[PDB]
Amino acid sequence: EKVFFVTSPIYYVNAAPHIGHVYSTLITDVIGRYHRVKGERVFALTGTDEHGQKVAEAAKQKQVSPYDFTTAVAGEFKKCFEQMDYSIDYFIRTTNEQHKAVVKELWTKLEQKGDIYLGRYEGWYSISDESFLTPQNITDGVDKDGNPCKVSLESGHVVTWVSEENYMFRLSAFRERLLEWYHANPGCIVPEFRRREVIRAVEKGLPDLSVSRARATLHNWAIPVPGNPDHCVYVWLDALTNYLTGSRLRVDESGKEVSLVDDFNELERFPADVHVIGKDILKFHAIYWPAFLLSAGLPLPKKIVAHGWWTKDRKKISKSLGNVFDPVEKAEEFGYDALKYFLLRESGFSDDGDYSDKNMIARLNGELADTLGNLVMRCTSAKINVNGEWPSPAAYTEEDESLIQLIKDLPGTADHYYLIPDIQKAIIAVFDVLRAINAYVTDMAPWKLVKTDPERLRTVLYITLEGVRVTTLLLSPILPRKSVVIFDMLGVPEVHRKGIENFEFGAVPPGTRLGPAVEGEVLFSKRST
Ligand code: MET
């Protein structure tokens, strides 16, 4: 029994925030939310990666001091995530003094167990990705302007040769112990094919890792290696330590950090239950990170879910090349909950998704408006629900027991998808049941039963309300604002809107009064063809 701990990756602050970071954090936010809906202590963590050469030089380009720059951008991030209506507990910055204490404390652990030694790194490097790459992983390409140069195959960004005396981590010694972990825990990297990638890599062989860099190279914009001011710590070790730092910070209601604890157990968050990340940063989390943690004798995480990169109208995203995709703007256009749904629904973690205003409307009209929207407006109209209450149900037909089974079985299958995690599958799961409820309703024809057979209408309405309820509960994390509006319409008491107990069918007693119906309001609004 522990605080469920879920992360988004801390984002480089070299440019403004955009869909990549928003999507990543939404997943994190959703996973966190669901576990809270369960009624569990949760700790969600997003943040910014502010040190290193990439950011140091991005500051230099705009021609302002990095101290000013990083605080400026971090602000654009805090603003945007605040606009997206997330429920992240704390927002972490690698410039934070408590974080340094941790980073240094972690360093010394690695040093005291003798897994750090002074060496050299002579090889390729991407500043834009802050990644060490072998000659096999680089190719010919084009300079930021004219000239021929070498680029990364992974990312297409320029690589420079580096020949520095660095401090070296014995990553090569943790190959065998990594492969046991990949096996021992064969659902610890999601999705499965990304797990096969990681194993295949570690199987080939692992070099040692440069965990320090010549102070000059970095423009002194990093964390000093303990005992040697000539060096600074690899921006990635710095960043990967964010998870441990955040696990150790007591946090006030205003959201400001108020204290760094000595030991990770004191807050019961570490090790992270889930690390949400993107495909592009897999090796750091799936190879380096566990190797570090093993070295330092800390526990390893439970799950790492890597996702893909987005597009718009089948063309990659770029502010400069004619195809932008501003989430705060599209959220203001179509609705914040609606946009989150689309992003979570349209593409699963094994896929590089495709937004378009066409499909956004298709799914908004088809699913949000027509499936779910009509269902809540039906079972709560004056027309069908003449007493504005939860009716007491008569005897159940087999076709009733049929639907009830779905509704009963739904929580458990959604629990699994949410836990994998596979948020797409979980949404579909729910909607299958919503579709099933709209069939049952069309078939029972309650509009007609209000005059023919009120004793029967009681059993239909009840099942429909309880269906809509349980489905809405399990969509809570996806549609946080709209689920509340739904629950209000239904008149579901606040105690019943959360908690594992209210997954069970029949948790709201009959006689429960519905919410006051406002005439002007709809739940979802259709858009043009
Ligand atoms: C601690 S995970 C770091 C992620 C990295 N800063 C990025 O934005 O890709």
Q: Which two tokens stand for residue 475?
A: 């969509």
Residue with tokens 């951008």: 73
Check pocket membership of 128 for ligand 1, CB cut-off 6 A.
Answer: no
- Whole-Å CA distances, 471 to 58, 65, 115, 433, 468: 46, 51, 51, 7, 5
Q: Which two tokens stand for residue 363?
A: 């799914």
Architecture of domain 115-235: Beta Complex (2.170)
Burial (CB < 10 A; 0-12, 13-18, 19+), residue 194, is buried
Q: How far apart are CA 247 and CA 264, in angstroms?
A: 6
Whether the ω angle into residue 207 lies within 30 degrees of 0, i.e. cis, is no
Q: What is the DSSP letter of 317?
A: -
- Whole-Å CA distances, 433 to 209, 343, 427, 524: 50, 21, 10, 19
Q: How far apart are CA 306 and CA 275, in angstroms?
A: 8
Question: 76 has which bridge partners?
Answer: none
| Cβ atoms within 10 Å of 246's Cβ, excluding its own | 30
Q: How far apart are CA 106 and CA 295, in angstroms?
A: 10
Whether the ω angle into residue 191 lies within 30 degrees of 0, i.e. cis, is yes
Angle, in degrees to the nearest 10, between helices 454-475 and 423-444:
170
Q: How far apart are CA 140 and CA 84, in angstroms?
A: 40
Q: How are strands ordered across the β-sheet holding 212-214?
A: 212-214, 228-233, 224-225
* Residue from 281, 282, 293 whose mutation best tests the ligand 1 pocket (most atoms within 8 A of CB): 281
In the chain, where the domains are located: 1-114+236-355, 115-235, 356-529
HEC-encoded secondary structure of 372-424 = HHHHHHHCCCCCCCCCCECCCCCCCCHHHHHHHHHHHHHHHHHHHHHHCCCHH
Check pocket membership of 242 for ligand 1, CB cut-off 6 A.
Answer: yes
* Residue from 49, 155, 242, 289 whose mutation best tests the ligand 1 pocket (most atoms within 8 A of CB): 49
Residues 6+ apart with CB under 8 A from 243: 7, 45, 270, 272, 275
Resolution in A: 2.9
Residue with tokens 């592009």: 280
Identity at 472, one-letter amino acid code = T
Angle, in degrees to the nearest 10, between helices 19-38 and 66-83:
50
Comparing C-alpha atoms, which of 410, 399, 403, 409 is closest to residue 471? 410
Check pocket membership of 17 for ligand 1, CB cut-off 6 A.
Answer: no
Cβ contact 310:346 at 8 Å: no
Check pocket membership of 240 for ligand 1, CB cut-off 6 A.
Answer: yes
Check pocket membership of 50 for ligand 1, CB cut-off 6 A.
Answer: no
Q: What is the DSSP letter of 121?
A: E
247-256: Cβ within 8 A, 24+ apart:
247/5, 247/43, 247/272, 248/98, 248/102, 249/90, 249/92, 249/98, 251/89, 251/90, 255/89, 255/90, 255/91
Q: Which CATH code fits 1-114+236-355?
A: 3.40.50.620
Q: Compute the distance from residue 444 Cα to the ligand 1 centre, in Å.
A: 53
Check pocket membership of 406 for ligand 1, CB cut-off 6 A.
Answer: no
Q: Compute the distance from residue 281 Cα to the ligand 1 centre, in Å.
A: 7
Question: 306 has which bridge partners?
Answer: 277
Q: Which two tokens stand for residue 98?
A: 């408590």
Burial (CB < 10 A; 0-12, 13-18, 19+), residue 174, is buried
Cβ contact 277:24 at 8 Å: yes
Closest ligand 1 atom to the C-alpha of 239?
1
Closest ligand 1 atom to the C-alpha of 280?
9
* Residue from 53, 236, 282 whose mutation best tests the ligand 1 pocket (most atoms within 8 A of CB): 236
Q: How far apart are CA 233 and CA 224, in angstroms?
A: 6
Check pocket membership of 282 for ligand 1, CB cut-off 6 A.
Answer: no
Q: Compute the distance from residue 141 Cα to the ligand 1 centre, in Å.
A: 25
Check pocket membership of 52 for ligand 1, CB cut-off 6 A.
Answer: no
- Whole-Å CA distances, 521 to 382, 426, 481: 14, 28, 15
Check pocket membership of 281 for ligand 1, CB cut-off 6 A.
Answer: yes
Q: Which two tokens stand for residue 164?
A: 């520095």
Characterise 153 by phi-psi region: left (phi > 0), alpha (psi -120 to 50), beta (else): alpha
Supply the Cα-derived Rg of the chain in whole angstroms.
26
Closest ligand 1 atom to the C-alpha of 277?
2
Check pocket membership of 239 for ligand 1, CB cut-off 6 A.
Answer: yes
Q: How far apart are CA 219 and CA 232, in angstroms?
A: 10
Closest ligand 1 atom to the C-alpha of 285?
2
Check pocket membership of 11 for ligand 1, CB cut-off 6 A.
Answer: yes
Check pocket membership of 12 for ligand 1, CB cut-off 6 A.
Answer: yes
Closest ligand 1 atom to the C-alpha of 281?
9
* Residue from 7, 8, 10, 293 whose mutation best tests the ligand 1 pocket (most atoms within 8 A of CB): 10
Query: Which of the four CATH numbers 2.40.50.100, 3.40.50.2300, 1.10.730.10, 1.10.10.10 does domain 356-529 have?
Result: 1.10.730.10
Helix (H) or strand (E) holding 357: helix 357-363
Residues 6+ apart with CB under 8 A from 317: 18, 19, 310, 311, 323, 324, 325
| Cβ atoms within 10 Å of 493's Cβ, excluding its own | 13
- Whole-Å CA distances, 1 to 93, 244, 270, 303: 28, 19, 12, 17
Q: How far apart are CA 261 and CA 263, in angstroms?
A: 6
Residues 6+ apart with CB under 8 A from 43: 3, 4, 5, 6, 32, 89, 90, 246, 247, 267, 269
Closest ligand 1 atom to the C-alpha of 129?
9
Q: How far apart are CA 233 and CA 316, in angstroms?
A: 33
Q: How far apart are CA 279 and CA 289, in angstroms?
A: 15
Q: How far apart are CA 498 and CA 36, in angstroms?
A: 8
Identity at 114, one-letter amino acid code = G
Q: How far apart are CA 69 and CA 74, in angstroms?
A: 8
Distance of CA 51 to the CA centre of its chain: 23
Q: How far apart are CA 301 and CA 166, in angstroms?
A: 28
Q: Compute the distance from residue 473 Cα to the ligand 1 centre, in Å.
A: 33
- Whole-Å CA distances, 203 to 63, 175, 177, 196: 45, 8, 11, 10
